[PDB]
Structure formats: C-alpha cells, structure tokens
Structure 1
C-alpha cells in the first residue's frame, strides 16, 4: 500500500498486485478478464514474445524466471491493473523492460494490449 516500500511477494492470491509471479508485470492480470494465471481470455491472441523477471517465491524460498506474455487484440481490460518493476531495466535492456507492448507474434497481427499472463519458465537467482 505504500507505493514506495520494497515490494513484498505473497503466494496466496493471483488477482493481487503483490502476487509473487507479477513482480515485473505492467498492465493487467489476465485472470481478471477471463484468462487464468497462464492463459489468455477468449477472443484475444496470445503473443509469442516475452519479457522476463526473476521473482522470489515465498512458498518455496526459490526465485523463478517468469517469462510474461501479453494477450492482445482487445482494448485494455481495465480490471486488476498492476505495475511492478522488480529488476525492471530501461527500454535499452528490452528483455527486462516492461513499458513495451509485447504483442509480437500474436495471431492475426493483434497488437493492442489486453492483459498479461505470468507463466514460470525456469529457476535462477
């Protein structure tokens, strides 16, 4: 709640901006517009491009790499908006940069931002 305090991950609610895998999310959580933690909502198009963060999982003490993915082709969902920036680097380090609309690769050249999923792709601190 204090926007400036160190972020504190939890592993008990994915709709919340402090959910551990959203440590470098920018946009909206897909679970809140009919995706799930790792699937896009009906009628949107799943980007193949990704951004990564290393996120601490307070359930098991391990940090995991979250390759975020955008669900594209719809106006922005407006539900569960969140912006975190753990490890987020400026645009010239685009692999860790999250202001970019990462809709590349989405079916039907969809490029509008609807929401982001947070699947794990491996471990590493």
Structure 2
C-alpha cells in the first residue's frame, strides 16, 4: 500500500503486484488477460527478448533469476497493472531495465505491449 515502502515479496497470489516473481515487472500481469504466469494470452505474440531480475522467493529462501517476456500485438490489457523495480537499472543496462517494450522476436513483428510473463530461468548468482 505505502508505494515508497520496501517491497515485500509474497508467494501466494500471482495477480497481485507483490507476488514474488513480479519484483521488476512493468506493465500488466498476463495472467489477468487470458495468459498465465508464464504464457501469453490468445491472439498475442510472445517475444523472445526479456529483461531480468533476481527475485527472492519467500517460499524457499532462494533468489531466482526471472527473465520477463512480453506478449505483444495487442493494446495494453488494462488489467492488473503493476510496476516493480527491484534491482531495476537505468536503460543503459538494458538487461535490467524495464521501461523498454521488450517485444523483440515476437511473431509477425508484433511490438505493441499487451502484458508480461514472469518465468524463472535460473538461480541468482
């Protein structure tokens, strides 16, 4: 609630902006527009680029690398908007920057932003 408070991860609701894997998500959680935690909704196109973050999972005490990927080709869902920036770095460290529409590699040249998925790609070190 306090926007300026240190973000506190939870591992019990993926549609909430404090869900642990959304620690540096920008946009809309795809689970809220017909996708899932790690799948894009019907009719959109899944980018192959991503920005990453190291997100602490309070379930297991481990930090995991989450490589966000956008679902592209649709106007912004407007559902479950979230903006978190844990570890988020300015645009010149784009590998960690989250204002960029990371829609590259999406089928059909799709570049409009619809929502973001939060799959894990590694343990953080």
Task: Give the alignment's TM-score, normalised by structure 1.
Answer: 0.99
Aligned residue for 2:68, secondary structure, equals strand
Aligned residue for 1:99, secondary structure, equals coil
Ranges in structure 2 where 5+ consecutive residues have no aligned partner: none
Number of residue pairs the alignment of both structures matches:
125
1:23 positional shift: 0.1
Ranges in structure 1 where 5+ consecutive residues have no aligned partner: none
1:66 positional shift: 0.1
| Distance of 1:122 and 1:104 partners within structure 2 | 21
1:22 positional shift: 0.1
Which 4+ stretches in 1 moved above 3 angstroms? none
| Distance of 1:93 and 1:50 partners within structure 2 | 13
| Distance of 1:50 and 1:114 partners within structure 2 | 14
The two structures, once aligned, show a CA RMSD in angstroms of 0.5
1:98 positional shift: 0.1
| Distance of 1:13 and 1:123 partners within structure 2 | 21
1:124 positional shift: 1.3
Q: 1:52-99: CA deviations, max 9, x gaps?
A: 000000000000000000000000000000000000000000000000
| Distance of 1:44 and 1:89 partners within structure 2 | 27
| Distance of 1:72 and 1:15 partners within structure 2 | 19
| Distance of 2:85 and 2:93 partners within structure 1 | 13
Residue 124 in structure 1 maps to residue 124 in structure 2: yes
